[PDB]
Design a protein around this ligand. Sequence first.
Ligand SMILES: OC[C@H]1O[C@@](CO)(O[C@H]2O[C@H](CO)[C@@H](O)[C@H](O)[C@H]2O)[C@@H](O)[C@@H]1O
Ligand SMILES: OC[C@H]1O[C@@](CO)(O[C@H]2O[C@H](CO)[C@@H](O)[C@H](O)[C@H]2O)[C@@H](O)[C@@H]1O
Ligand SMILES: OC[C@H]1O[C@@](CO)(O[C@H]2O[C@H](CO)[C@@H](O)[C@H](O)[C@H]2O)[C@@H](O)[C@@H]1O
Ligand SMILES: OC[C@H]1O[C@@](CO)(O[C@H]2O[C@H](CO)[C@@H](O)[C@H](O)[C@H]2O)[C@@H](O)[C@@H]1O
Ligand SMILES: OC[C@H]1O[C@@](CO)(O[C@H]2O[C@H](CO)[C@@H](O)[C@H](O)[C@H]2O)[C@@H](O)[C@@H]1O
Ligand SMILES: OC[C@H]1O[C@@](CO)(O[C@H]2O[C@H](CO)[C@@H](O)[C@H](O)[C@H]2O)[C@@H](O)[C@@H]1O
Ligand SMILES: O=N[O-]
Ligand SMILES: O=N[O-]
Ligand SMILES: O=N[O-]
Ligand SMILES: O=N[O-]
Ligand SMILES: O=N[O-]
Ligand SMILES: O=N[O-]
Ligand SMILES: O=N[O-]
Ligand SMILES: O=N[O-]
Ligand SMILES: O=N[O-]
Ligand SMILES: O=N[O-]
Ligand SMILES: O=N[O-]
Ligand SMILES: O=N[O-]
Ligand SMILES: [Cu+2]
Ligand SMILES: [Cu+2]
Ligand SMILES: [Cu+2]
Ligand SMILES: [Cu+2]
Ligand SMILES: [Cu+2]
Ligand SMILES: [Cu+2]
Lengths: 341, 341, 341
Amino acid sequence: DDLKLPRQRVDLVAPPFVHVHEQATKQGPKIMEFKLVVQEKKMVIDEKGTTFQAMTFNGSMPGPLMVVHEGDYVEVTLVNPATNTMPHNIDFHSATGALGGGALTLINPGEQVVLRWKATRTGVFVYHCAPGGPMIPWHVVSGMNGAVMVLPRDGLNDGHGHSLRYDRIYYIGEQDLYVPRDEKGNFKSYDSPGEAYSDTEEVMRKLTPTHVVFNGKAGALTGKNALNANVGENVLIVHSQANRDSRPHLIGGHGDYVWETGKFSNAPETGLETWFIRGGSAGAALYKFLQPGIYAYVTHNLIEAANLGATAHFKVEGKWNDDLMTQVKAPADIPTGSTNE
Amino acid sequence: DDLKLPRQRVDLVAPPFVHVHEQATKQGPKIMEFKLVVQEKKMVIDEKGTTFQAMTFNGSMPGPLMVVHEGDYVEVTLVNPATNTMPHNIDFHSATGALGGGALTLINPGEQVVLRWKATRTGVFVYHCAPGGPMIPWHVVSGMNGAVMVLPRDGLNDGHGHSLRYDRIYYIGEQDLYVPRDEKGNFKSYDSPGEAYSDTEEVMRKLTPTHVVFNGKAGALTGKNALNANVGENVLIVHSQANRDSRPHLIGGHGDYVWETGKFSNAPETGLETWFIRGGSAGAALYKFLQPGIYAYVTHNLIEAANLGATAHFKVEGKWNDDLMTQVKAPADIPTGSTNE
Amino acid sequence: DDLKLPRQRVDLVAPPFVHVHEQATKQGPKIMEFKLVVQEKKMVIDEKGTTFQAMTFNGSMPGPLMVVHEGDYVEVTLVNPATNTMPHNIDFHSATGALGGGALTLINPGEQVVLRWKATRTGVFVYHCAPGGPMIPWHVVSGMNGAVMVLPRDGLNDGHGHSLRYDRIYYIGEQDLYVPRDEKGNFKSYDSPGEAYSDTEEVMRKLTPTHVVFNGKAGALTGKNALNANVGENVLIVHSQANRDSRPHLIGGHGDYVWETGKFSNAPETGLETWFIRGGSAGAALYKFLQPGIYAYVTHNLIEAANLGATAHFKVEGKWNDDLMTQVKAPADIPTGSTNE
Ligand SMILES: OC[C@H]1O[C@@](CO)(O[C@H]2O[C@H](CO)[C@@H](O)[C@H](O)[C@H]2O)[C@@H](O)[C@@H]1O
Ligand SMILES: OC[C@H]1O[C@@](CO)(O[C@H]2O[C@H](CO)[C@@H](O)[C@H](O)[C@H]2O)[C@@H](O)[C@@H]1O
Ligand SMILES: OC[C@H]1O[C@@](CO)(O[C@H]2O[C@H](CO)[C@@H](O)[C@H](O)[C@H]2O)[C@@H](O)[C@@H]1O
Ligand SMILES: OC[C@H]1O[C@@](CO)(O[C@H]2O[C@H](CO)[C@@H](O)[C@H](O)[C@H]2O)[C@@H](O)[C@@H]1O
Ligand SMILES: OC[C@H]1O[C@@](CO)(O[C@H]2O[C@H](CO)[C@@H](O)[C@H](O)[C@H]2O)[C@@H](O)[C@@H]1O
Ligand SMILES: OC[C@H]1O[C@@](CO)(O[C@H]2O[C@H](CO)[C@@H](O)[C@H](O)[C@H]2O)[C@@H](O)[C@@H]1O
Ligand SMILES: O=N[O-]
Ligand SMILES: O=N[O-]
Ligand SMILES: O=N[O-]
Ligand SMILES: O=N[O-]
Ligand SMILES: O=N[O-]
Ligand SMILES: O=N[O-]
Ligand SMILES: O=N[O-]
Ligand SMILES: O=N[O-]
Ligand SMILES: O=N[O-]
Ligand SMILES: O=N[O-]
Ligand SMILES: O=N[O-]
Ligand SMILES: O=N[O-]
Ligand SMILES: [Cu+2]
Ligand SMILES: [Cu+2]
Ligand SMILES: [Cu+2]
Ligand SMILES: [Cu+2]
Ligand SMILES: [Cu+2]
Ligand SMILES: [Cu+2]
């Protein structure tokens, strides 16, 4: 064993939640140990019950958020159980060399592999499967993508010498899906990913998704699964898109501090309405809630948001601030003496 | 009346022009009073006379630019005359709470509502209708979107302690439209927005506009309606797109100072060729004209610019500067002694 | 002759290579003389041998990279040989006035023209043909676009007072193509550009390319034409896209310093995973290679990368650094005592 550092095992949690971590740390570098198990399975992706043949890390779309600190080593055990049908691997955009690790991690069903990469670059980054050739886009748009956050050891800052600390963190993975339709326009079902491939590839080629979803399905983060917050809390929202651009917006809020390219060596932008996640990247926004109520978090192509699945909700508890906004007069009949031309 | 500030009524003007305002001000905060009247009407959107069932604020696409200063309060009377067929509301991306105001402003035909929001965030911002669900994209891509500018009280600056002042301002609202076609490819006409909806939604779902226009129609800002300027003038060009990305470019010019994310707390970028307006945002560019003549202002997807409607012109008066550019030799026959392989 | 500066003739080279130049210079301003010869010709654009009716500067897609310094004058002789069928011109996004030069450079087959523009703006910039109207997008998506780099006279810097110097430079021109298909889905062939136009325009209108290629064809920069580098070298990668957005990513690497909007008066961003070239612009990234092996350089819409042609390779010589990344355990059977749920 050449590398003589303490080891720490991390238990991942399903998105949009994030495993326990420290923001700032005075611990030295560690070997941070993670396990990812590939799971191919049929999943429900919309509110009408449409299914499709997904491929996942750890059973979720997105794959879980991994969080480490600058200078840590990340030792990932990737497992491809023999119930799976395809080979898989992993490419970390946070890592240096061998196609992000993909060239060192190709495993057949029944195999596992252990990759270590040094976390030399701060930010949020995509990770994704990339077996080779046309299998690269297919595995990614089938769900095989997640993100990793590499925090500075002193935690986040505003790029102007002031520390920033979040009260809460959520990870929003956005997924573009390409579900085949029959001649009548109904979504087609298949018994395996391999059977779905040819028809799926034809949809992929036209670069227009059938669905754009957060946390793996339309409505996943609405209703009973809305994201909780409180007035006053500084919330970090990490957003990834491994294949296609997105334009996040918090309806009724702002991005107080936004790293749209997602890299903490760059000062954030302030007071954004809408930001831009380039396909193949993660970004992050901090917002301090000022008002209670429901907020919609969307990609601000509103067709994608409302009609293809890409809306989440926050439910924020606290007291309303009438100075920031008030209904001066409730809806009422237009006065008879009005002229409205 | 809890809020004891002076009130000022603003008369809006149709785009691309902007109502009278001060850049820098020493007045304290005011309650700035605006009126927006929803108008559903058939409108001509291209040079072949194609019509479509539009929905507007104040009869225009885009809706008018509102201009206030940081710390002002904005009291908006939204009116939905009883000649309209649908409910409408308004979401200000500049505002904090209640989905930007949409949750406090839903009005049926025959009603009006009064919303007040504090202008706490500087920049240019979209405002748009957002009734709920699939009606959100439909009302926005039918034309119900505009912008508001919240200036710093000291006016604009270059992010490096130098004041910037514009001689002229224009507001370019870009609109993506989704007009149904019949089996022969001809655009379909309808008698009401409700009748157009189902067919329109089908076009919307494929995320490919039929038209991309400035100021509501192909050719709106060309010919006799070209934008005027003079050599030496510093012109602010505000650009909004409430649903879809755009990439503005001034052909023959530059962006001297560009806030592509549109927020004045961030230093502008300098000397851009082309900039990027993320769907769901406004941005702004300053340019000091150096040469007279015709300039085309486009989105630099040139197919959209030339073939789907997204070109404006500036006509700039003044004297040509042969140091910056000259025709050394006019077109002439290729010399006989030339080799051109 | 009013302009009394030394003249220097530059011999252009085919992309992805770049003509000999100095980074930093103490020479004063010069008149830098370039020749571009339009060539319309059928070209092979994919690995199955698909052809299409291309239009080029100097016989290549992209056109060659021109490199000058701030304050130089650029005197371009544009030649349209009489074997061509169409008029052509040139618009420099680096230039000020007359639609970038397009309004001074329209030439019929059999003619040439000489344009001079002052290089007042630093950065990488697109140049492209723009005859007028619908011919603008058609000539650009037929291949008539390249880039020019205007270096500061002191060479590049990190925006924080430190000089940056590249060991190598490559120019990656990305081209979106719109090749017609017949009723069976096979790509159609034509005998001239004029014959291809009507069918091509119909594909263009739907804003979905059939191919997205680097250096004019799928596979152009893979295999024997991979880009060479060595561990330790700082490589500048200039990327242009004259019509459509792109999201470059170096698989297994990063962008150490990235000017995504492409203009050297703005500090670069650091440590990017993926960056964004807005359609109608050039950008640039510096990366110091740290690991040997194969790197893929893609647009990170992976469908475009793997299935529509947009992948290049770097082959990097040197010694592997096991500290940055190592395969701890090669692929092996999942242990019997494992639980992987
Ligand atoms: O700022 C650019 C910088 O990236 C460098 C920093 O010295 O390195 C990055 O990658 C290296 C991998 O070891 C580390 O030096 C560094 O800690 C990390 O951001 C260079 O390659 C260069 O100057
Ligand atoms: O979208 C085309 C066409 O297909 C139908 C079924 O004929 O609906 C399908 O497509 C809809 C939009 O994606 C989905 O809402 C639904 O799950 C699916 O069956 C038609 O209703 C539609 O006109
Ligand atoms: O810079 C981030 C900053 O936004 C803050 C500023 O203190 O507030 C913004 O929203 C508030 C609404 O009252 C105002 O304080 C401020 O004037 C405006 O930009 C915080 O929520 C935070 O530090
Ligand atoms: O675009 C398809 C097809 O439709 C036709 C009419 O059959 O033209 C229509 O579409 C054109 C492009 O949008 C418009 O220029 C025109 O207003 C519209 O009728 C065909 O000419 C075209 O081939
Ligand atoms: O920084 C904005 C700046 O651009 C200016 C610089 O003074 O000019 C640019 O274009 C001019 C063309 O002569 C040059 O002054 C300058 O060297 C170049 O970047 C103004 O128009 C303005 O302040
Ligand atoms: O893409 C539709 C359909 O066309 C066919 C020929 O019928 O293949 C063509 O399109 C393919 C994808 O672009 C190309 O790979 C090939 O060069 C082209 O002939 C079908 O195979 C495909 O199903
Ligand atoms: O070593 N201190 O947390
Ligand atoms: O299945 N995804 O959260
Ligand atoms: O590993 N590819 O299916
Ligand atoms: O303002 N949100 O769509
Ligand atoms: O109060 N002065 O404008
Ligand atoms: O109708 N719009 O300017
Ligand atoms: O208010 N919706 O049609
Ligand atoms: O350079 N304008 O397309
Ligand atoms: O004039 N010196 O290179
Ligand atoms: O033909 N282009 O490199
Ligand atoms: O010059 N146009 O074909
Ligand atoms: O990580 N590259 O696709
Ligand atoms: Cu996989
Ligand atoms: Cu990747
Ligand atoms: Cu409405
Ligand atoms: Cu909005
Ligand atoms: Cu041409
Ligand atoms: Cu251009």
